[PDB]
Amino acid sequence: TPADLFSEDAVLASLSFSKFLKHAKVRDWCAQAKIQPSMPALRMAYNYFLFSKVGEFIGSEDVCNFFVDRVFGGVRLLDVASVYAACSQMNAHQRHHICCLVERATSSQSLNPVWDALRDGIISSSKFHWAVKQQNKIFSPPLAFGLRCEEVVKTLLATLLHPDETNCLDYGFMQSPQNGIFGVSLDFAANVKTDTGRLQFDPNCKVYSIKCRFKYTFAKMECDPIYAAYQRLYEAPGKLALKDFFYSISKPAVEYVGLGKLPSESDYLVAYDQEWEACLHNLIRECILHNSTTESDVYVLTDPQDTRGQISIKARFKANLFVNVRHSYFYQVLLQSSIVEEYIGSPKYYIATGFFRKRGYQDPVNCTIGGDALDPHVEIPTLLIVTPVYFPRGAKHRLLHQAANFWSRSAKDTFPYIKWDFSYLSAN
RNA sequence: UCUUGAAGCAGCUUCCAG
């Protein structure tokens, strides 16, 4: 059914910013000579019509209450023109407040179809690398990672790394209040504070990017090459034991780089030290300089077959493994770091990677990750590698610019009728 | 039917060769 956001009444995902901009009423509005739509003003306007329809259904009508009782001055504005004019008059504290309400309204990581309509027309953390590469879209007119990976590694971080600090597992969609052309979601964040007032980001916190490599998913069999390397690591955890574990497969997660000699889009980890030898250019060089100092944190998890189901840190050590600044993950965490900074006005960012093993017949049915239980269908976690990510300001600014120009070019090509005013956007 | 090329959201997936 044709989902109309200007009406008075799956199909919830078809309430896009693309559908809003392509709509006849908006098309007739842009047709006037005086009309020069700016960003984030049009995005903020779209956010009203989206929540005037979805808001009542999804329970909380807080987004529209702020828009009407503080942005429209009690008036329940109905037409595009009035809503845009009121939205263009919004101050930064007001745009930020709407963005937070939207984030709390979409606090269900990836189960609401609102999330689907919200992502469209925005450069998301995942999609960021593609946008900076300038490759083809932004405007478009399964759980084999959520349950199987994210959940497991999240619980691992929640109960083993930060079981003392107050943490937040599920974050909503964080649209950029400064531009409205960027939007991220946080996998996990630890040591967070709450107002009165909802959640608030503190520069003394750690934001995690939960990703995991099932390349190393081995089976407890004498023959198995990965299992052989893991056993050596389990009863002797160290820098050298990790090297055997990583080079136990044909396409490894670690890569050797000469004198900062440039890596490849192979994987997320990279090592510059001798012991790991196995067999825009300038922007890459600037990033390598910043990431080659802080070591990766490696967690060897206890075997539930040996520790009566209780998975905990058997041993923890440091590895000279750094983030691949060419790989997607770096750019994904870059965009996320940029929006966190915006919602503030710094937190430490990391890539938490899980390493597993197949569940055997002799493995306990009921397993516990510190305090909370593990699903009997999912694979057993054996290792956790926490990699710090550092972003040089100059490089971060240069990249966000390239992506913004790509958004500017695509939005002007996809929507020819809209007399876009990117002079207002030029600030961010 | 597998491993070595390449390509994209994590494993798979999409085009090959031998």
Author numbering: 6 to 14, 30 to 156, 160 to 164, 176 to 230, 232 to 314, 324 to 389, 399 to 481
Question: What's in the article?
Answer:
Transition to the lytic phase coincides with the rapid degradation of ∼80% of all host mRNA transcripts in a process termed host shutoff (HSO) that is thought to promote immune evasion and enable viral co-option of the host replicative machinery. In the γ-herpesviridiae, HSO is initiated by the bifunctional alkaline exonuclease SOX that has been shown to possess exonucleolytic DNase and RNase activities. Owing to the presence of a PD-(D/E)XK sequence spanning two of seven conserved motifs shown to be essential for DNA turnover, KSHV SOX has been classified as a member of the type II restriction endonuclease-like superfamily confirmed by the crystal structures of the the related Epstein–Barr virus alkaline exonuclease BGLF5 (3) and apo form. More recent in vivo studies, however, indicate that SOX-mediated HSO is instead initiated by endonucleolytic ‘nicking’ of target transcripts followed by exonucleolytic degradation by the co-opted host scavenger exoribonuclease Xrn1 reminiscent of nonsense-mediated decay.
K2-31 was successfully co-crystallized with the SOX E244S catalytically inactive mutant (see Materials and Methods: Crystallization). Closer inspection revealed that K2-31 has a near continuous stem loop configuration, interrupted by the presence of a 7 nucleotide bulge (disordered in our structure) immediately 5΄ to the UGAAG motif. Interestingly, the protein-RNA contacts stabilising the complex are narrowly distributed with most restricted to the catalytic region and the K2-31 loop. In our structure, A20 and G21 at the apex are recognized by a series of hydrogen bonds involving Y373, R248 and F249. Further stabilization of K2-31 is derived from a stacking interaction between the adenine base of A20 and the aromatic side chain of F179 located in the bridge. In order to achieve this, F179 moves ∼5 Å (based on Cα-Cα distances) relative to its position in the DNA complex. Surprisingly, this alternative configuration of F179 and the N-terminal end of the bridge is stabilized by a disulphide bond between the sulphydryl groups of C183 and C247. Despite use of the inactivated E244S SOX mutant, the absence of density for A19 and lack of a phosphate group in close proximity to the essential catalytic carboxylate D221, is indicative of K2-31 having undergone cleavage over the duration of the crystallization experiment to produce a product complex. Inspection of the SOX-K2-31 structure reveals a complete absence of interactions between SOX and either the phophodiester backbone or bases of the UGAAG motif. Our mutagenesis studies have shown that while C247 has a minor role, F179 is essential for RNA but not DNA processing confirming the bridge as an important factor in substrate/product recognition where it directly functions in RNA binding as previously hypothesized.
